[PDB]
Amino acid sequence: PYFDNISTIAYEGPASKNPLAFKFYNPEEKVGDKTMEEHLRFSVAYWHTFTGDGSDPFGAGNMIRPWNKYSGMDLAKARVEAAFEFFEKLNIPFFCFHDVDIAPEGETLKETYKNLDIIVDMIEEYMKTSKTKLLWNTANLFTHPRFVHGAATSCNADVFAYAAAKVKKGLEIAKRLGAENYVFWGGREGYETLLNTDMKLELDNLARFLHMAVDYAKEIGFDGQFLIEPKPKEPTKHQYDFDVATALAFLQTYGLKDYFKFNIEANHATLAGHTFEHELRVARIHGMLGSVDANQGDMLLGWDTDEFPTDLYSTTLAMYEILKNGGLGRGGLNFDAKVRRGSFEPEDLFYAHIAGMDSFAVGLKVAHRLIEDRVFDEFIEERYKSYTEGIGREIVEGTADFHKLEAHALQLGEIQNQSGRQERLKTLLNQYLLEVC
Amino acid sequence: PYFDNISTIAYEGPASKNPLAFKFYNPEEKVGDKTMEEHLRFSVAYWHTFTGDGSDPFGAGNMIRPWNKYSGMDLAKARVEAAFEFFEKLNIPFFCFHDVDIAPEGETLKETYKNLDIIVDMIEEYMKTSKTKLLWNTANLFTHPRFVHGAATSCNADVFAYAAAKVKKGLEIAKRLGAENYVFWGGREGYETLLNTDMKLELDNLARFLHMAVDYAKEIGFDGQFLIEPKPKEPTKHQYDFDVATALAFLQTYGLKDYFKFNIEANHATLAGHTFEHELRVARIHGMLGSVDANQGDMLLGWDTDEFPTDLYSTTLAMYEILKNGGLGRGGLNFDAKVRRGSFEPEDLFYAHIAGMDSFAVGLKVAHRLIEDRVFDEFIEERYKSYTEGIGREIVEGTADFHKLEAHALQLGEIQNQSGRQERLKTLLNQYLLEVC
Amino acid sequence: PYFDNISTIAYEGPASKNPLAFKFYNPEEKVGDKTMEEHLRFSVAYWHTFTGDGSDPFGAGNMIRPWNKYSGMDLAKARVEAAFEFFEKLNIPFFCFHDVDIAPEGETLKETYKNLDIIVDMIEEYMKTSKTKLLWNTANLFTHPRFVHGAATSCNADVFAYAAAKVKKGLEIAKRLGAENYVFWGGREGYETLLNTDMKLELDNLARFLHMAVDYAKEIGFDGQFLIEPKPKEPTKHQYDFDVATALAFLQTYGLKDYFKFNIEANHATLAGHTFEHELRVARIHGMLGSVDANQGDMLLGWDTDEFPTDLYSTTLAMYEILKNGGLGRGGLNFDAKVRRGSFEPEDLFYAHIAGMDSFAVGLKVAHRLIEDRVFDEFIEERYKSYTEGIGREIVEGTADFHKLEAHALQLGEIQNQSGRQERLKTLLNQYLLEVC
Amino acid sequence: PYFDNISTIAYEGPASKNPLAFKFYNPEEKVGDKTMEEHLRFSVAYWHTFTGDGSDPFGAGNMIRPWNKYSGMDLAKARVEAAFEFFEKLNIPFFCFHDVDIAPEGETLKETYKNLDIIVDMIEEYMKTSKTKLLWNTANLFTHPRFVHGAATSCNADVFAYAAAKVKKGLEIAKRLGAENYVFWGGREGYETLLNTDMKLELDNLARFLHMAVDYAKEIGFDGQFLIEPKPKEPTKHQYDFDVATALAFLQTYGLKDYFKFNIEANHATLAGHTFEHELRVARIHGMLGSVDANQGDMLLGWDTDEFPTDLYSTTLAMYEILKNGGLGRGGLNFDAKVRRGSFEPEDLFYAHIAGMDSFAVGLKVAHRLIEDRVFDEFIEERYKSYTEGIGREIVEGTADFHKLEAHALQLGEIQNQSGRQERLKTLLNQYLLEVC
Ligand SMILES: [Mn+2]
Ligand SMILES: [Mn+2]
Ligand SMILES: [Mn+2]
Ligand SMILES: [Mn+2]
Ligand SMILES: [Mn+2]
Ligand SMILES: [Mn+2]
Ligand SMILES: [Mn+2]
Ligand SMILES: [Mn+2]
């Protein structure tokens, strides 16, 4: 029907000259007590994969897709058929979408709702016969001209109302299709210039908005995990949920912290000047690592590139964080990635996903070994042991004060420290990377 | 004695060809209900001004200073004499210092304390005859090899003890000289690599450390304002108090929030990818704008340059934030700036400070007009008025929910927004800048 | 007709509360021996101003324009009428355009040519009754899907042919409408990944392409100035004419240097990690400062923002370079700027241009004073005078060698240098900025 | 004597739990027709390895080294003994140094020369019994206060003379010890501010300086390869030889191009916003890839970090460029890297170098396979074949013009392009990385 050239993609192993096969991702291979499929919980982004056109700030849409002949609802329906065909052939457990990705917006809200329901009906009775499930859905509060000054942070109370309606419908669809999570991304929730901005009001309203959401979620009995996806900027000059930490500060200020977890996207972390691992670590130690958008940016380019994950250091390092968190739990590895404008052929959708999946399979395999062999843990445990005994243990138990500490410091000679062993640790990481065979 | 060429610097007005005079900073000129001196509360950084040598990662110290002939305690004493001479000639209300700036460290802690006390005695009986007062002092927990793995975040509990002692002595000196504030800067409180880092432990300990400090402060009856100075990185690959917001998250997590306010440094804000104004705004709307380090970096250079503030847009924009905060209160405008390595002559210390002071005088003058003429406020007030009436007011009073908002959105036609008027606002800013005459 | 609200914009002076008037740009005010209009040679970018829609990588077109009701050729024609109305009301001497800005592309090249000719006929007989003239035009070799792998650097020789045709027609239109310059921008002339790139071939072909152009220009008797507009990246991961210097290297390698000059755009310079002034200076000292795209980016944002020039330090500093070059000569100050997505009203096109024009008027005024008062020149002349006499003069005349220099160095004691006086120079700049009254 | 713990480091293979052994670098393993040792031509940087102290812009020297007990010439001599011991134990073919690294500077030039000669005598009669040879030496024209305004670009002609003398002596030492290359790095050859800079003069003088050098080199009969090492900035706000391309432009302008080749350092390339491979590629296609400084920076940190190369993608990708250049020829892989301040123990010097050497061994191994299997070449050859036949071949032979190309374009339908296959190529790269076993 849509992808006729492509037959169902299978795991063929490392020594395999077949471009359309998994070299490392074996869905049922066990890594510890769970299979690769259970560990990785892969998900495809509806937006990039089925509605993306390869357009560029300086280029027109160039993507070649079979469903391009259609318009309107025919196109919406065509994409659903295509979507599920792609899911089956690639063997993906999950997918994600924004409301505007699946159905065309109407001239009035009532219309939008109609088109949406139609498409949701179609999606529901398809899930019926597919292994693929909805990881999370979300409301697109940034693309329409109406959200020009924000959504919940808009200076126009009508826009606040409209955004609320689209999130209300969003949660209903989530409940209906049994989404495991619901994602919020504040694309326009920031500022373009402080000069015309009442920041305290905007933040107050953003909090009021989120409160209303968690309330509605209870009322309809949603029970899926609420997620916030941080980003430093783009489109905005400054986006409010800049960081995992920055968003955390916000949630704490307004007492929304217990209702939320974070959706961390690699490209977003690097754009904030942090490493992907760093953002995962911070989320993790706060018990707020909700889910992951697995992509990769270019660190020499200051905008989102949404590339597929091929860098094995990143995947390894990310997986290490994820495994230590006890896994993704309710979230998954959603490929919020996009083929390069130069990879405009249909088969590139497959090449791209295989690349990302194999890269994460490798990362899972090695991150796991690093953990079971206590490669880094062995050392960390050894270098922090001063806090296990004597004065250190007093500091930790909370039985030390400036008096005792000063008294102690006074009898101290030259303090001796040991190496952080960075080059060694880095060398070790390489050795484990290369021991994938 | 030290600066013989230089006579006491006076305000001479705009049309004055004299390089050694204030063109805009008139200590007693009234701007609103306070004089420029009361508004600006200028302070000089002991470190850069009296101990800086113009060294460079690739260059040896090149600064030419009169007190260079001396060594050890003679040098420490010489600098104090020089310091107060400089304060008098420049007419500065305040100064700041790290413990290591004023006295040479000893081979043992007991020695360090002796040298410190000697110099503190000398400083105290000098304040006796000077208008200059101590804005804030601080403990240098980054320069010594002992702090290589952090101070309170060190993996060596002995280093935690040592840091605690130096902060204990720090607070005693603060109490003794009547410092208005006490600053903490976590130069080594971060990481060089996550690979060997137990982040949750380090953060836990940083919190335990700060708790012990606020406890000691109560015990000795300090009552000055505790300040935390954020920075994204340098020396560390990642410094924990990355941001005003990031540090806020930390303080909230450990319940230290009521004891602290922030010391915001321009170069640090830009290094985190924020504008100076932005950091002030965020601090301000949280009632945590404690004090300012008035410098300026180069946005094309990714390290701290600590230049003197000459950019008038920045000074204006910063002052606007400060005035809206109700002023600096207990803090001040500490010139944590440093002359360019090319400006190695003694007179450059004066040229530099005059430049920074005049620039802030201008900024104060125009920021004030912008505020009294309601230039930006007029507009902000107008564009957010939807939240004053009808549905908007319901949202704010907290009497709205997804139901009412959706009901409202359903009867809505095309939503109309108005321009953010950015170019206009920017044009206006220029007009006010140019109306300084 | 199109802008009914707006009446012809006039110079009203500094103290004028009228938003729709020039506060500093007085077309006929003399600054030295030329009027502001002759100095500034302002130009409007057809693309942003008449075809821009405010779309955003995450947002749909939101701009409100009177000619939006039209489609196809009606829209093309409508825009021409509108364009000239705007030119008249704003009093602009020049404009610029890409072929695709003025007429809709056809399904075949022959069609494209037809539509183009029609619109060119219309433009020509309009210039007939207008003061506005064509500064430069250019061929858009980046927007169409066909240029996905480059134009002259494309791996598809058919695309090379097509690009050549569009540049051929481009030069004919230039000759016909009497363009003063012709601009080349290599938007897709770079790479997305080195992995599939034969760089030496691409560069060889880029040179062959440019050679063919200067040859055709001679054949048809064009005689306008060829210009190359550098940019580091975006859309490309790396664009070949990265820099003024990088492009220079290229032109020198292939002997195209005498035929070209540079079109420098502020945002592009900052994106390459240079200051606007820097790029102008480099071009200038090589006699290759051809023309300017007067915009401004955000240094905290790593993509082109194309803002209107409001920063007065930049305009002053740029104008200083331009005046020292002996003026723009054949080029001009083309506003390759774009209103913020938040400034979506028609009147913002006017506010924006007024802002940019006044900002450059101010910059011209003060840059000129700096030059006539020899503010910086006085000093530069003094600090380099060692090369005027003795050994220095020998070095310059070329009568010195390592022998004499070593002999000299051997008899030298401690070398004495003097301050670079940076803070002083910066302070001075401010004083002149503020003396605009 | 110096490194007693450490015994001579040997190649032990991949499965080896010994931290002090090569896992991948086997000096005599053949890769193609040359052994790993002949291919890699490793070199150690005297400066970082023997004179580095781990100091930091905010930290004192913390490095622990056996020769620290000594001062003056005893220290200089001690380091030479240590240096050669290290070379032997690590089995390094080459080393590099700045004049100031090996001997202490005197109070007068005559003194400096004496100390230098003494140490050079010692080095010479040590090379006598060692396999290690001098890859290249250089003159340090940035560390001394005298070079504050540049060296050859200094505004003080006495400094130009002094720099010339130190370069003259530099070339004599090179000739004497048989250096294969001589490196120039313009650390202070740039500007801190354009405001006081006569750029054309500075550049003119830089060229005069380099001319005098190549002349002296001929006079004394040096015959080693002159190298220029580009860098964008640091210490300077802008360094003149910003880029490989920028430096190329300079050399072309002054006709120095035939005498020079480039020394490319990874961290410098990334700092200019280019990838390491990119800089090598550009140099390479111009026949100017002279030698390499093998380090690695952090792309989230905007200053030189000089880390040891552990990232295998980089080493692979760099080696691919080097192999295609026909190897390093006369240059080598000089570890201009430095241990992290946290790796302050003596044994870290070994861990660090092993890490870098193994990483490059791996890179050599896989880069070679990529080349022999024509992995990328196969594809590049296929996608550019339009330039082999028909119109394409005409373009290349130089028998095409705008007329023929337009005529051709006119008969063209829809142009068809094929995928750039980026994700595929990236996936392939991973497969080869993982096939190192
Ligand atoms: Mn993204
Ligand atoms: Mn995302
Ligand atoms: Mn600082
Ligand atoms: Mn500071
Ligand atoms: Mn642009
Ligand atoms: Mn442009
Ligand atoms: Mn370096
Ligand atoms: Mn180097």
- What's B23-92 look like in SS3? CCCCCCCEECCEEHHHHHCEEEEHHHHHHCCCCECCECCCCCCHHHHCCHHHHHHHHHHHHHHHHHHHCC
Helical residues (DSSP H) of A143-298, grouped into ranges: 157-177, 199-219, 244-253, 266-271, 276-285
How distant is the Cα of A151 from the closest Cα of chain C, in angstroms?
13
Which residue type is seen at D25? Y
Q: Cα(A350)–Cα(A6) distance, rounded to whole angstroms?
A: 9
Contact indicator for C102, C138 with CB cutoff of 8 Å: no
The Å distance, Cα C336 to ligand 6 centre, comes to 6
C345 touches chain D (CB under 8 A): no
Which residue type is seen at A397? E
Q: Which chain D positions have a beta carbon within 8 Å of B194's beta carbon?
A: none
DSSP assignment of B244-290, as one string?
A: HHHHHHHHHHTT-GGGEEEEEEHHHHHHTT--HHHHHHHHHHTT-EE
Q: Cα(B434)–Cα(D186) distance, rounded to whole angstroms?
A: 41
Q: Cα(A366)–Cα(D204) distance, rounded to whole angstroms?
A: 56
Long-range contacts of range B405-411, CB-CB < 8 Å, 24 or more positions apart? B405/A160, B405/A161, B405/A164, B405/A165, B405/A168, B405/A212, B406/A161, B406/A164, B406/A165, B406/A168, B406/A169, B408/A158, B408/A161, B409/A109, B409/A158, B409/A161, B409/A162, B409/A164, B409/A165, B410/A109, B410/A110, B410/A165
Chains that touch B (3 or more CB pairs under 8 A): A, C, D
B392 three-state secondary structure: helix
On whether D293 is known to bind a ligand per the annotation, the reply is yes
Cα Rg of chain A (Å, integer): 24
Q: For chain A, give me the number of helices (H) and strands (E)?
A: 16, 14
Strands C10-11 and C21-22, bridge-based pairing? parallel
Contact indicator for B269, D92 with CB cutoff of 8 Å: no
Q: Cα(D86)–Cα(D8) distance, rounded to whole angstroms?
A: 9
How distant is the Cα of C370 from the closest Cα of chain D, in angstroms?
11
The ligand whose atoms approach the alpha carbon of D271 most closely is 7
Structure tokens given for D291: 């030698």
Ramachandran class of D274: left when φ > 0, alpha when ψ lies in -120 to 50, beta otherwise: beta
Other Cβ atoms closer than 10 A to B287: 10
Judge residue C105's burial from the number of C-beta atoms within 10 Å of its C-beta, 0-12 exposed, 13-18 middle, 19 or more buried. middle
Structure tokens given for D356: 């870098």
Structure tokens given for D321: 């460029």
CB contact under 8 A, C423 and B339: yes
Q: Cα(C144)–Cα(C167) distance, rounded to whole angstroms?
A: 14
Q: What is the DSSP letter of A51?
A: I
**Which residues sit opposite C95 in a β-bridge?**
C44, C134
Whole-angstrom CA distances from B38 to B94, B283, C250 are 11, 22, 58
Q: Cα(A279)–Cα(A265) distance, rounded to whole angstroms?
A: 9
Q: What is the dihedral of CA C64, C70, C74, C78, to 10 degrees?
A: -20
On whether B265 is known to bind a ligand per the annotation, the reply is yes
Which residue type is seen at A108? T
Question: D312-324 and D276-285 helices cross at what angle (nearest 10)?
Answer: 0
Q: Cα(C268)–Cα(B399) distance, rounded to whole angstroms?
A: 50
Helical residues (DSSP H) of D220-285, grouped into ranges: 244-253, 266-271, 276-285
Walk me through the domains of chain A, giving residue ranges and CATH numbers: 1-437 (3.20.20.150)
Q: Cα(D196)–Cα(C421) distance, rounded to whole angstroms?
A: 8
B299 touches chain C (CB under 8 A): yes
Whole-angstrom CA distances from D348 to A423, B204, D55, D57, D66 are 8, 30, 16, 21, 13
Tell me how many degrees the CA angle C343-C346-C349 measures, rounded to the nearest 5.
Answer: 70
Helical residues (DSSP H) of B339-374, grouped into ranges: 347-372
Structure tokens given for A267: 């490209």
Q: Cα(A4)–Cα(A250) distance, rounded to whole angstroms?
A: 49
Is D98 a known active-site residue? yes
Q: Cα(D301)–Cα(D310) distance, rounded to whole angstroms?
A: 17
Contact indicator for B161, A411 with CB cutoff of 8 Å: no
Structure tokens given for C118: 């029609």
Q: Which of C157, C65, C154 is nearest to C343 (CA)?
A: C65
Tell me how many degrees the CA angle C376-C382-C385 measures, rounded to the nearest 5.
Answer: 135
C149 touches chain D (CB under 8 A): yes
Contact indicator for A17, A307 with CB cutoff of 8 Å: no
- What's chain C look like in SS3? CCCCCCCCCEECCCCCCCCCEECCCCCCCEECCEEHHHHHCEEEEHHHHHHCCCCECCECCCCCCHHHHCCHHHHHHHHHHHHHHHHHHHCCCEEEEEHHHHCCCCCCHHHHHHHHHHHHHHHHHHHCCCCCEEEEEECCCCCCHHHCCCCCCCCCHHHHHHHHHHHHHHHHHHHHHCCCEEEECCCCCEECCHHHCCHHHHHHHHHHHHHHHHHHHHHCCCCCEEEECCCCCCCCCEECCCCHHHHHHHHHHCCCHHHEEEEEEHHHHHHCCCCHHHHHHHHHHCCCEEEEECCECCCCCECCCCECCCCHHHHHHHHHHHHHCCCCCCCCEEECCCCCCCCCCCHHHHHHHHHHHHHHHHHHHHHHHHHHCCHHHHHHHHHCHHHHCHHHHHHHHCCCCHHHHHHHHHCCCCCCCCCCCHHHHHHHHHHHHHCCC
Q: Which chain B positions have a beta carbon within 8 Å of C427's beta carbon?
A: 310, 351, 354-355, 358
Q: Residues 6 or more apart from B5 whose CB is under 8 A from it?
A: B346, B347
- Strands (E) located in A83-236: 94-98, 133-138, 181-184, 190-191, 225-228
Other Cβ atoms closer than 10 A to A377: 14
Strands D181-184 and D190-191, bridge-based pairing? unpaired
Contact indicator for D266, D295 with CB cutoff of 8 Å: yes
Instruction: Note the resolution in Å, 1 decimal.
Output: 3.0
Structure tokens given for C350: 């006017």
Q: Cα(D191)–Cα(C67) distance, rounded to whole angstroms?
A: 50
Q: Cα(B252)–Cα(C48) distance, rounded to whole angstroms?
A: 46
Cα Rg of chain B (Å, integer): 24
Judge residue D395's burial from the number of C-beta atoms within 10 Å of its C-beta, 0-12 exposed, 13-18 middle, 19 or more buried. buried
Cα C330 versus chain centre, distance = 12
Structure tokens given for D229: 């090492």
Burial pattern D218-243, b for ≥16 Cβ within 10 A else e, equals eeeebebbbbbbbbbbbbbbbbbbbb
Q: Which of D166, D155, D253, D263 is nearest to D216 (CA)?
A: D166
Contact indicator for D301, D267 with CB cutoff of 8 Å: no
Structure tokens given for A134: 């909805």
Whole-angstrom CA distances from A177 to A41, A48, B247, B323, D99 are 18, 21, 40, 52, 73
Q: Cα(D401)–Cα(C216) distance, rounded to whole angstroms?
A: 8
The ligand whose atoms approach the alpha carbon of C306 most closely is 5
Contact indicator for D131, D27 with CB cutoff of 8 Å: no
Q: Cα(D277)–Cα(D300) distance, rounded to whole angstroms?
A: 19
Other Cβ atoms closer than 10 A to B398: 10
Structure tokens given for C161: 């042919």
Contact indicator for C192, A341 with CB cutoff of 8 Å: yes
- Strands (E) located in A268-330: 289-293
Question: D347-372 and D72-90 helices cross at what angle (nearest 10)?
Answer: 40
Assign 3-state DSSP to chain B and report helix, strand, coil percentages, each to 5: 50, 10, 40
Contact indicator for A135, A181 with CB cutoff of 8 Å: yes
- Intra-chain end-to-end CA distance of chain A, in Å: 38
Q: Cα(A437)–Cα(A14) distance, rounded to whole angstroms?
A: 8
Contact indicator for A8, A91 with CB cutoff of 8 Å: yes
Which residue type is seen at A283? A
Contact indicator for C291, C260 with CB cutoff of 8 Å: no
Q: What is the dihedral of CA C73, C78, C83, C88, to 10 degrees?
A: 140
Strands B21-22 and B10-11, bridge-based pairing? parallel
Where do we find the tokens 């399979």? A361
**Which residues sit opposite D42 in a β-bridge?**
D333
Structure tokens given for D119: 């140490």
CB contact under 8 A, C302 and A298: no
Q: Cα(C316)–Cα(C329) distance, rounded to whole angstroms?
A: 18
Judge residue D380's burial from the number of C-beta atoms within 10 Å of its C-beta, 0-12 exposed, 13-18 middle, 19 or more buried. middle
Chains that touch A (3 or more CB pairs under 8 A): B, C, D
Strands B30-31 and B34-35, bridge-based pairing? antiparallel
Q: Residues 6 or more apart from B384 whose CB is under 8 A from it?
A: A155, A198, A201
On whether D265 is known to bind a ligand per the annotation, the reply is yes
Backbone angles phi, psi at D184, to 5 degrees: -115, 125
Nearest residue, CB atoms, C415 vs list D146, D246, D387: D146
D267 touches chain A (CB under 8 A): no
Judge residue D413's burial from the number of C-beta atoms within 10 Å of its C-beta, 0-12 exposed, 13-18 middle, 19 or more buried. exposed
Q: Cα(A327)–Cα(A321) distance, rounded to whole angstroms?
A: 9
A145 touches chain C (CB under 8 A): yes
How many CA atoms lie within 13 Å of D132's alpha carbon, on the beta-carbon side? 27
Q: Residues 270..289 of B with a Cβ closer than 8 Å to C: which?
A: 270, 273-275
Tell me how many degrees the CA angle C48-C54-C59 measures, rounded to the nearest 5.
Answer: 145
Question: B276-285 and B312-324 helices cross at what angle (nearest 10)?
Answer: 0
Assign 3-state DSSP to chain A and report helix, strand, coil percentages, each to 5: 50, 10, 40
Where do we find the tokens 């307004």? A254
Tell me how many degrees the CA angle A202-A206-A207 measures, rounded to the nearest 5.
Answer: 120
Where do we find the tokens 């942070």? A153
Q: Which residue of A has its CA nearest to C140?
A: A58
Strands C260-265 and C238-239, bridge-based pairing? unpaired
Q: Cα(D49)–Cα(D336) distance, rounded to whole angstroms?
A: 9
Q: Cα(B47)–Cα(B306) distance, rounded to whole angstroms?
A: 12
Helical residues (DSSP H) of B294-342, grouped into ranges: 312-324
Structure tokens given for C255: 């002997």
Q: For chain B, give me the number of helices (H) and strands (E)?
A: 16, 14
Q: Which of A361, A363, A380, A381 is nearest to A429 (CA)?
A: A363
The Å distance, Cα D223 to ligand 7 centre, comes to 26
Which residue type is seen at A259? Y
Nearest residue, CB atoms, C406 vs list D165, D253, D386: D165
**Which residues sit opposite A291 in a β-bridge?**
A263
Q: Which of A58, A18, A90, A57 is nearest to A308 (CA)?
A: A90
Contact indicator for D387, C201 with CB cutoff of 8 Å: yes
Contact indicator for B270, C300 with CB cutoff of 8 Å: yes
Q: Which of A348, A369, A384 is nearest to A428 (CA)?
A: A369
Contact indicator for B100, B143 with CB cutoff of 8 Å: yes
Experimental method: X-ray
Which residue type is seen at D341? R
Contact indicator for A277, A289 with CB cutoff of 8 Å: no
Task: Report which secondary-structure segment, H or E, holds A408.
Answer: helix A402-410
Where do we find the tokens 């004023």? B102
D405 touches chain C (CB under 8 A): yes
Is C98 a known active-site residue? yes
The residues of B annotated with a catalytic role in the active site are 98, 101
Q: What is the DSSP letter of D45?
A: E
Structure tokens given for A119: 């498409």
